Amino acid sequence: EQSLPFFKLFSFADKFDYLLMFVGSLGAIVHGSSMPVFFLLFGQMVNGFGKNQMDLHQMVHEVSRYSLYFVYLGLVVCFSSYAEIACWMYSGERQVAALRKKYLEAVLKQDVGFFDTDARTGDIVFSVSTDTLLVQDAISEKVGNFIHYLSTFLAGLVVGFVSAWKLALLSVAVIPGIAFAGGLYAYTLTGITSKSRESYANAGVIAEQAIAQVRTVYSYVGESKALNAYSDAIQYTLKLGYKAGMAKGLGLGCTYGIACMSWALVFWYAGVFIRNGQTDGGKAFTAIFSAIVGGMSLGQSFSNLGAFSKGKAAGYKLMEIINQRPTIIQDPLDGKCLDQVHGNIEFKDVTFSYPSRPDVMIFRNFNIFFPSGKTVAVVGGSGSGKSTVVSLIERFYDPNSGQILLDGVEIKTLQLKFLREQIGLVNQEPALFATTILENILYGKPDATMVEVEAAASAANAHSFITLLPKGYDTQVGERGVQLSGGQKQRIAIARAMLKDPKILLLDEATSALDASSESIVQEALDRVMVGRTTVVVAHRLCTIRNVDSIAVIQQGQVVETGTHEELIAKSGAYASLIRFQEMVSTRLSHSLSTKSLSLRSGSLRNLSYSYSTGADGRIEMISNAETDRKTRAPENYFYRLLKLNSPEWPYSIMGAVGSILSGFIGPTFAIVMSNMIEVFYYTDYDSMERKTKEYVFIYIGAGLYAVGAYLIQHYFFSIMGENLTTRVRRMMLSAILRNEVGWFDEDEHNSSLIAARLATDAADVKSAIAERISVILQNMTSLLTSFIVAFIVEWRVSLLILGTFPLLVLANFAQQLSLKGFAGDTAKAHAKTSMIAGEGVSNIRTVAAFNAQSKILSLFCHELRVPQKRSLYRSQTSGFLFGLSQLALYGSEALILWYGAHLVSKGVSTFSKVIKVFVVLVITANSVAETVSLAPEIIRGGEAVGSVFSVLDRQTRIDPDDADADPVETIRGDIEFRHVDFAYPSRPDVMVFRDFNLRIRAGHSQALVGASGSGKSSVIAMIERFYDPLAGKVMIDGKDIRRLNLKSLRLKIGLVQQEPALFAATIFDNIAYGKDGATESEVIDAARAANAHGFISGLPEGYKTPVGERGVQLSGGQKQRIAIARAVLKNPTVLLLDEATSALDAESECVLQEALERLMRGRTTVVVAHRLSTIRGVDCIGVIQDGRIVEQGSHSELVSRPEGAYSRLLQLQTHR
Ligand SMILES: CC(C)[C@H](C)[C@@H](O)[C@H](O)[C@@H](C)[C@H]1CC[C@H]2[C@@H]3COC(=O)[C@H]4C[C@H](O)[C@H](O)C[C@]4(C)[C@H]3CC[C@]12C
């Protein structure tokens, strides 16, 4: 939407952060203008190094002096790279840790009705969690990289032009010839990747329907031809992935062919400007190098502007809640405070609707009255706003038309520390904050004593169960060490509402846990506190309502009838039907936040975002998302396994490993030709400096064509090898997902949106683990290897001191590559315990608003942000100092090589152009050896988070769909029998609805297992075919054990009809032929005319063909059911399995099954399940299931001849319309 300016992000800065930024921006400039000053000190050295070739005593003076200037330079990079990291990492924290402390003083004071779950309480939690890490990343340390590399651009054009100005206008005019083709590569490379994401979305729904509809894919045995349609929609992404590698070889070959055809330019006119008597070799070495690293260093300053715009986007979403003004606030001076309350709450002509949406009407002309010291029961028959009255006495909402008065005093003239203090609240699923179980009791009263805490939990059935825990009333209720994790939480929350002693006592519908004898223990606990209190009882079910002494019932906007439970039960006026209605009878945020986290982290790395889960039943768990270090490593023998899978392509690596050694030879060849022209620049024969600088230019032309035909080989090959590996893995993963049991798909983190992404991204970076980490190892170990053979043949007494100095040159060139991406490191991990305290004080705000606990959540927040600051005080003084010390050894150890270089020449041993060739080669080599030691952990350390796709390859399924040691099935006659069998759902193993079930179904008959009010009715058809396994006992079919038979040989003559039918993304000719392999045209027309939709299939535009899955014509719920019954009649099964539940038919003028009851049940053994007692006339037998057993069985002529049984209770439900 909108955005702030870049300033006003620096508006929480106190009078101490205007001092850490003044110092911290003199560190960023003096460290900036010290690489173009290095090119002036090293430039003036060579003037004295080789000018003085005839006087070997002036050499020792003018190199011993300029070597001392490197140590004086290294001590100004020592104390100025320390002052841009120890003053921007720490002063970017004290400004953002005062943004968190005022954003939470804003969302504790807004009106409580601002949060009604409508992507609102799932948005304030996300804004405090991630949007305060984007304002931190924008102002903390990437401002130091914006000043650093900009000042090199402004001081690379001042050292350059002052030395020799006719060479700082050639070298500047080169850079738009390199950056032209250096960005045309980066344009066309994106122009093919976007043709790959579009070429994959054809197969992004084929591996999406085959998992979300897995019950149908296993029922009709067609889990093989979801692999002959997924394989051929990857072959059009492989072939598009080949010419996205050729456009990487011709995008790096035409950059070393413009770079190495441009050093020949600036080194030719240096050979002219010296022959005219204008410059020398130390004023043409300064002008060229200072104006290129000055010109190349704008590509790093403008890399920070991507992060300075998210900090203006996320900066405005925070700064429109901090300065938002709410209505219902506390007036400490313009607000009264009474005494000796009585509690006669009265609603006097109040009308109200929700201010989120004023469409519906809730309390149109509403009038109820509350006595003093009595109980009422405000109850509706439906959602008539019966749960709204507790949200209005608390003044969570003002009544927009009406008045509410306490003892003849309107509540709009009282302060919100005296009104909310007198009312207690006990609600749905009572909120306990993840602290000790002693501090939760002290929310109802902050400080009285210890002995009243024990007396409060005494008369609440709580004094014992918090002593049967092996500590002194102290248990971390979030960290599930010793769990009071029953469905009956031992209700300490009722003990909160007793210690507070509220006069008005709002109770709520706190019987919503499938009540039993456990919920009757807390029932008398509520019955013993309700004395002398003006209390209400809001109830949803009238089972425990039997002793309430003045009940009032509302239906629509007002109360219908009042009185005690002698005259309310009388007269049958709108109460007898409601008690008849009694006789006829979170985890949403974490799924919502992860979808907001999905497709929003494509640029933010794994050190800044989170990954939201459900955790325990205390908090909302926030994983720091830097779990790639110490969570779920790969198998240790993976790198040999991923080479065994990728070995029919051996001739595409031998053509690439003898094509990646040839690119290691552009490392010495750049540094030998360039370090021979410093020699040539100091001749004194001006027609032998000419015909030797012609040879050193034709090599630059002849090595800008060697770099074209040695990157087309390195990157085209090793992309034939890298795309026949992310094609064989994706086919070996779908063929191993579609083999498991059905219960693995039932789990929440294995749904069909976290499993079609593991085939799109997590299996697409096996290319970047065994093909992009052998190319940059064979290259970098033949550039390290042939530049330590040149350096020893030329001169070996200097290149043995560099070899002892070489761990220090490769360390200083390694710390200059961590600094490009910040030294902060995993900044979402320290601010994780802090964020959950803001996370639990937003979603539990209806318990923070009562008890006046809006200052103790803030004092668990300012007392705890002290730890992630003193973590970021030691990390910013160590990382700032060790970076400022490793740079002292880069400049301070080139002073030792060059001084010892002038100790061997002056004693007659060496010469010039043998000390420089040893120096130039072994420093440019050390710049790319510290790239090999940067990808060195990620090979050993478990690969990475995408090299661990072996959980889907190596996972032994509980049910094996095919065997060799199992006899197949020839012909089923139908002998369905359940022996002594119990069963539980493996998703939630506490559900135990099956207890020793038994049936016996004879061939050529039917079965009519009734609904019985949803007592686990939809699991008999989930065991005739093995979608699950029983816990004990045998399932007998056709006289044989079912776990001894070939599963694919059995399912091709047992066909179900789905509860909720959905179709595949194809025509209506495949979706009616998917259930029969081989038949084409003859019996497909007539089987379409069985759930006769023939005018529906003749009246259709393109004959039979029409898209019905997606992006075509849309069908109704009554017409999609007609398609699924056309499948089963073409398959012609032996055991039919119908399923009807939760009134999902919805087909008025019912003729889709009036035809199908008598046509599809001719010789088929059917098992019908339906909750409706209509169109269920099983002509053979009928049964009733209760508690995992049958209670009554037989045909429908002896079940009705018996007087009651249990079927007569179901017979009442026909008149219960
Ligand atoms: C005086 C130098 C020899 C100095 C000691 C040396 O440390 C220097 O800082 C090195 C690391 C730099 C100076 C100039 C740089 C080059 C200047 O920019 C270029 O022309 C590019 C072209 C291309 O991008 C190459 O891959 C790197 C290459 C060719 C750069 C590679 C590294 C350098 C050669």
Swiss-Prot record:
Reaction catalysis annotation: (indol-3-yl)acetate(in) + ATP + H2O = (indol-3-yl)acetate(out) + ADP + phosphate + H(+); brassinolide(in) + ATP + H2O = brassinolide(out) + ADP + phosphate + H(+); 24-epi-brassinolide(in) + ATP + H2O = 24-epi-brassinolide(out) + ADP + phosphate + H(+); 24-epi-castasterone(in) + ATP + H2O = 24-epi-castasterone(out) + ADP + phosphate + H(+)
Annotated GO biological processes are: acropetal auxin transport; anthocyanin accumulation in tissues in response to UV light; auxin export across the plasma membrane; auxin polar transport; auxin transport; auxin-activated signaling pathway; basipetal auxin transport; formation of plant organ boundary
Task: Quote the annotated effect of E509Q.
Answer: Lost ATPase activity and reduced brassinosteroid export
- Annotated residues for binding of ATP 2: D746, Y985, S987, R988, K1017, S1018, S1019
Description of activity control: Transport capacity is stimulated by the chaperone protein FKBP42/TWD1. ATPase activity is specifically activated by bioactive brassinosteroids in a dose-dependent manner, including brassinolide (BL), 24-epiBL and 24-epicastasterone (24-epiCS). Inhibited by vanadate.
Q: Which domain of life is it from?
A: Eukaryota
Outcome of swapping Y256A: Impaired brassinosteroid exporter activity, but normal ATPase activity and slightly reduced activity stimulation by brassinolide
The protein's name in its UniProt record: ABC transporter B family member 19
- Supply the source organism for this entry: Arabidopsis thaliana
Q: Which gene encodes it?
A: ABCB19
